[PDB]
Amino acid sequence: YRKVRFVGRQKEVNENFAIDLIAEQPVSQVGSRVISCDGGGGALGHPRVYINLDKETKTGTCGYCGLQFRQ
């Protein structure tokens, strides 16, 4: 029903997708207890937030940042 509006109009949609583009990252490690996640360069990026990785194997990438992060 709705679908007759973009007929012949070629329907802009997003070639890439970030739905998961994340998992290709070389998930880092440190060798320590808690870390500083300020991302993308100093003072451009998420506010500094410290996360604890002590589980066994996991990490936690703060959720602003997304970038897979662990020890």
Binding site: Y1, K3, V4, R5, V7
Partner: protein, 319 residues
């Protein structure tokens, strides 16, 4: 499913399609679907810019345009595939120097009576005329009553419509008169006998459709459109001079879009009032509109102010 109130920027659940819908009638229907909410897919033939005067009709994202030819069996199949009701006003006056006019009431209304039937439209509709009779008349008036026969075969549910001679605002029916500043008014054919037909006012016809557009329960069952009272006189041609106080054309001018010394002069005097047993109007109503009151508006000429019009008509007889 209908939501809310019918003002504008509403839904009311019906899609549509209207073929033609550029010239006098079609423009004046869609304007009644650019109010109660719709999805009116109006295609059109050749005209890029003549369709703009329409666009402030549906709110936003309601009416939507396509391009089509109509002798290509695809162009009618690409649009309609999503539709609910589809009416058809298509067709015109004089034989074109290109379209041979014979089947444009036969092949075209069937060419769109192609996959429309197949693809699952419903409440398909078509137009007839009060005066078209398969006996011998009239060269244009004929081929129209063929559709009532030839086309009705397909789509057993139609509710095909049969109105009279109509008088609008920009219409060409009652406007062929009063354009007749000329060697003199010569009635057709110099006789005051059989005028006039049932002159219903264009609102009521265009309020009929959308009253049958979800009626319900009129499909296959054809209707015809009552005029006002009652038949009429010769005075109608005098009435013109009683008050009047005596798309895609070109850049410069055209070559021929004439008065047609042909069917045109004899199509207006064919009269033939016809079968009452058709339901045909108040049932689809509620509408009927007179003449004497609504003929000042559409008629404004070089006085532009004075009116003082007291003169009326009985019916007139055969009435």
């Amino acid at each position: 499913i209908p939501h809310g109130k019918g003002g504008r920027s509403s839904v009311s659940g019906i899609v549509a399609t209207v073929f033609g819908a550029t010239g006098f009638l079609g423009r004046y229907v869609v304007n009644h679907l650019g109010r109660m909410g719709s999805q009116v897919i109006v295609p059109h033939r050749c005209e890029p810019y003549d369709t703009m005067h329409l666009r402030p009709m549906g709110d936003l994202g309601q009416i939507i345009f396509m391009d089509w030819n109509g002798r290509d069996k695809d162009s009618i199949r690409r649009a309609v595939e999503h539709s609910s009701v589809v009416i058809n006003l298509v067709g015109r006056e004089w034989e074109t120097q290109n379209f041979d006019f014979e089947d444009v009431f036969v092949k075209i209304p069937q060419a769109i009576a192609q996959v429309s039937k197949e693809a699952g439209v419903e409440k398909f509709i078509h137009i007839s005329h009060l005066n078209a009779d398969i006996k011998s008349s009239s060269k244009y008036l004929r081929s129209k009553a063929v559709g009532e026969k030839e086309v009705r075969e397909t789509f057993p549910e139609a509710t095909i419509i049969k109105p009279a001679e109509i008088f609008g605002r920009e219409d060409r029916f009652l406007n062929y008169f009063a354009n007749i500043r000329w060697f003199g008014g010569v009635p057709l054919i110099s006789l005051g006998k059989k005028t006039v037909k049932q002159p219903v006012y264009i609102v009521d016809v265009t309020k009929g459709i959308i009253n049958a557009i979800k009626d319900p329960d009129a499909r296959g069952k054809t209707f015809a459109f009552v005029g006002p009272s009652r038949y009429l006189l010769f005075d109608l041609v005098q009435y013109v001079f009683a008050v009047a106080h005596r798309i895609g054309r070109l850049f410069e001018i055209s070559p021929f879009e004439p008065w047609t010394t042909r069917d045109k002069v004899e199509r207006i005097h064919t009269t033939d009032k016809i079968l009452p047993h058709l339901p045909g109007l108040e049932d689809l109503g509620v509408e009927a509109t007179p003449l004497e009151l609504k003929a000042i508006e559409v008629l404004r000429r070089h006085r532009t102010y004075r009116w003082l019009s007291s003169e009326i008509e009985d019916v007139q007889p055969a009435k």
